[PDB]
């Protein structure tokens, strides 16, 4: 059986309720357990068997649900709930799965990206390589999308991202985006773009360089 | 209640009333513990124009516990006072005399103008630095900051700077230009037992009468009177079979006074039956007719 | 209660890698035993059980491949895996089952072990320099960094100035590459007009080489 | 209190080699038979002693004596081993009851170790030091259940 | 250290979970304290040490925080919680301060005000001065912008303003506005007008009159 | 526990004034011991406190010009004002310090006491009319009202038809005046159709000058 976590990212502040959904692709009973990782930390039980506190776990936590519809309650959210909440099915033995996730961040406002672009340097061009390198600091939502451009045609399948864990002061995420060229597929080229759409910004910023 | 002679005394003194400071990029620093936190002279000593506390409000500071105190010593200008604190920046803050920004304590700081100028050039203070400084760190180096790309080479010269700069303290300089002593008394409380508690004054101490009594840390109550006991010399009060205080060593004295109980017993009326007499008479038992 | 996972390092594709668990803090010999392993982009998934009848059970994609066994004498748990694959790349954790009535759930973790799958062989990696420009700077604030490429296995620490700048710092976790090597990047935020006078270095130590390169970052 | 970097070969006077480099303090302060009992108790370090003469210069000399506490050292040191800096011996506590016999001044003459043999019980048990002719009840017997079936 | 309240003026019917926020300049550690002063009457002691409730406070009250972010909860509103809510910092004695404050109202809808204007009297006139009245009644939000026209130019720095406590009944408020000119400066300009602006009104409301 | 502030009253900028505060139900020579005040259009203020041994402390504002003073034998409160300025116009009060562990806060406040500071002398109300007009009715309804101004000190009662009419009334704070003399005003809603029918009758009363005018309010 599949479970589908809802939202992949939830935002809510220290003293927000929060409410995590899972749905199940077909009934499961009162068979879940929903379980709760630190960064860093292995994870911890929560509640089994729909609603069934377990012992350990704070009177903040609490939960319910049946078939397919379950939902995990933090009553107030506190800086060490900043967690992947993840829920799990029990009816299908032996196979147990989980759900994608649920990731509880601490909200604080909305916060714009600085963007930068950076050219390859002459040290990997000799080497026949050419890696352009975007970088995205101090925002939030953690999620941002960046749409690498050459010669304003949009890439795809040649890049890869990296994303920090939120910064424990200011609340926010940054991105590193790098678009992979060989140098072969860099001299064809002459501009070189990082263009970013995120929920502080009015409209998508594009910053950009000419090839030499 | 009964205390001990107080001595002993914290040197606050010695701190406050020094015949020196030391520079704000070499502050020192002496420690404060195993002694009484008596804060007597720092309470209105007229000469304070600033006193803030971090930690805890100065009306409870003279009455609860430590296990160190640490007093940091030195001299700046009055308009660096701002930046003995918690959450400051600046180059005293930052460079010269740092303090946590979570800080338990407090700030006492005075004007020295009659004291420390003349111009008085024995004051330094660090301008220079790669980084700023860690709570309680003192940098005393004196190496060539460096500020350009060319190495100085253990010399001044372009983009090369003797890190530590002196103050023109002078007699006549207007009041934010002036030195100030600042003292920053540093307080914290650890798993070790604490040893550096307010003074208490005794009550005068009152034999045969009925009180409740308070010697040290042990609670009684009765009648004190003179004891004919001698105790060890670590000793401090004595017991009776059944788990009784039977007598106490009083903290000032060195004497010893046993315990008697408050006078008691049961009253009985003595009559002749009321069938020829309504006169009675009333016996205390158990006890002495100068306590009824 | 108590558990330790070991046994996790560096295999090639198509070799093996043989994990452990310490257990303690309870009688081992009563519990069902499990595997779990966190892969990046997946999740948490589970692996295998071996219960106290001596009973096992593997996902169908794991069935054929790996052994699990317990040794009670010991209080410890083994798991044998064959056949490895690049895609078996993950956090390997052990877990304690129990239960209430007719409900199962998992209470105890290890803190897991990092097994890597890859056939390249350890990699000192090549650091270049991220230089600062005018395409770099906005509104008088700027950056400049590095970044760190083709390196193997992980980790790779990144800092600047040899620890002294600690503030505006941001480095980023690596991501593997289709070479089978690793790359990583980092970036410090300094005011614009610091750029050509205040000098930074990105400095990279790359442990499993004993590689460190200490990178003069300028315009 | 400083941490020390204590010599793994510590000790007119001239030569002092117990340690090289410190860091910061917390705490300071300023036929021979010498016996001491060091304890920590909630933080607090405690030093008992007792120093007299002796008439042997061959082994620990028998004899009954008692300690009384000197010095109150209230620093939160953790102790878990100890090194002593240079004929000694050394033994170690145990959670023992005892009886102490205190004559009319309140100096410890003479003692009982409750757990020694069963005299000693007897002694403990009659809450005397002395025992007249008799039987006494002391303790109870039971045999304990080991395995299960 | 200064201390920001948000908001200046919290709206929310009896019932309602009502948050108010306090923020320090720099960190406080947990020495926060919060109080509750009702009209006519001292403030009370709420909340001390950022989480330690008082005796005697309603258990509905509750609080929590650090460094420099602290929230006050009221887990249901009641009519007599109608009161000016204070923080105050006790990191640093002796000098205790307070924040601004947040009222907290009792929320009826919202409510237009009806705007009259009221020309200077004779008798006022006849010694030199003359002051223009505008009543803004039975209104809710408390807010309400009063512009000044003279010639329909703004007026500035020549005119105050009064307002009346959130009604008993019809929980609104009423707001006296007064632009006093001098009579040489009032025989000087023929029209005199005062609009209104107000979250009940779809657009701002001009009453206006001629001199004589 | 109770306590009662007094002394309150009218002084002229450059004068003094002395409070004092009843100080019942508690150990009073056992508690540290403060006064606060509060300004309309400031908030509440910390002005000074006394503590058990006998220290003192003030804000910058304050110090050299205020004395805090505690008689424990008569468990009595005083603070001497001297060197008063109009910005020192607040209501003060006294007020019980309490603390747990290392925690400082206030628990205990009286009723307080207005001290107002002006060079004006006590001056009667000029009272004027707000007639009613086409430009004060709007949908059948209409209002009519009075403007009180330049009296000192407060207060100022306004009620209409001696007390006869207790709804439709608006009757607005006080505001100080640069004159140094206070302002206020009131208004009845009235039907439009009243106007010129019934009789409102403004009726302002300054107790301080023993002053009262009935202001017959028309068209
Ligand atoms: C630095 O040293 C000076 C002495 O050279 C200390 O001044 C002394 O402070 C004490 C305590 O305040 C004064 O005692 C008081 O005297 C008044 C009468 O003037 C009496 O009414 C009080 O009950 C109390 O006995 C003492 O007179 C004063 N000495 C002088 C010459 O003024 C000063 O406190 C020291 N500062 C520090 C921080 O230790
Ligand atoms: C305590 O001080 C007094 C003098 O004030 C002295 O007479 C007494 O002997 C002292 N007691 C002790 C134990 O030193
Ligand atoms: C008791 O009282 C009676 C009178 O009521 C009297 O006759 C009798 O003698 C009295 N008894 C004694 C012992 O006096
Ligand atoms: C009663 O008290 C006096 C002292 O006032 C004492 O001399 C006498 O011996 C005491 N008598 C008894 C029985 O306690
Ligand atoms: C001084 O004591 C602090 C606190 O334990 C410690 O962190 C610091 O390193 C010590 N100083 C030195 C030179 O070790
Ligand atoms: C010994 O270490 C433990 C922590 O493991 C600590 O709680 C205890 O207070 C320490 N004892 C002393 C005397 O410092
Ligand atoms: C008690 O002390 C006195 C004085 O030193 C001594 O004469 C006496 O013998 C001692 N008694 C005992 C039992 O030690």
Redo the contacts between chains.
Sequence with gaps: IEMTQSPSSLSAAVGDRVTITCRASQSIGSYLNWYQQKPGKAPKLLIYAASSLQSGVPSRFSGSGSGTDFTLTISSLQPEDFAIYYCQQSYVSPTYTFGPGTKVDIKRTVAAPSVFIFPPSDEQLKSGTASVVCLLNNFYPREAKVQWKVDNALQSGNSQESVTEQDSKDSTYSLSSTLTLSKADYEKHKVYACEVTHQGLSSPVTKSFNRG | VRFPNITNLCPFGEVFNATRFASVYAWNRK?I??CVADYSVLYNSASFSTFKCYGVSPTKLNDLCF??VYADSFVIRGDEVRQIAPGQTGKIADYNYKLPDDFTGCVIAWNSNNLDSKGNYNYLYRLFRKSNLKPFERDISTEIYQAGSTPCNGVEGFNCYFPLQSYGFQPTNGVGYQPYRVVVLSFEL??????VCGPKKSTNLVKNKCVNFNFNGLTGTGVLTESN???????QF?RDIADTTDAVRDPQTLEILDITPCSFGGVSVITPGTNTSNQVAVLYQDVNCTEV | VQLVESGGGLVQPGGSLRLSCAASGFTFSSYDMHWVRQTTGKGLEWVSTIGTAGDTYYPDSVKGRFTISREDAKNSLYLQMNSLRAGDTAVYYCARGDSSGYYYYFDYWGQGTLLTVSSASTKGPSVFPLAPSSKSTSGGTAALGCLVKDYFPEPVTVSWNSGALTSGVHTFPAVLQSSGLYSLSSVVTVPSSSLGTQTYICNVNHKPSNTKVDKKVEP | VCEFQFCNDPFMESEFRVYSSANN?????VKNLREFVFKNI???FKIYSKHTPINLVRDLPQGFSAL???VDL???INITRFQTLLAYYVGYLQPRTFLLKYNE???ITDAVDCALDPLSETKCTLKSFTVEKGIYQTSNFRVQPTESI
């Design positions: 420690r513990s195993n296990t160190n650890l798993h070790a037992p604490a040893t006991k001698k105790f060890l010399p670590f000793q004595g | 303090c917390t705490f300071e302060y909630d933080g607090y009384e506490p000197l209230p620093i939160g001044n309140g100096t």
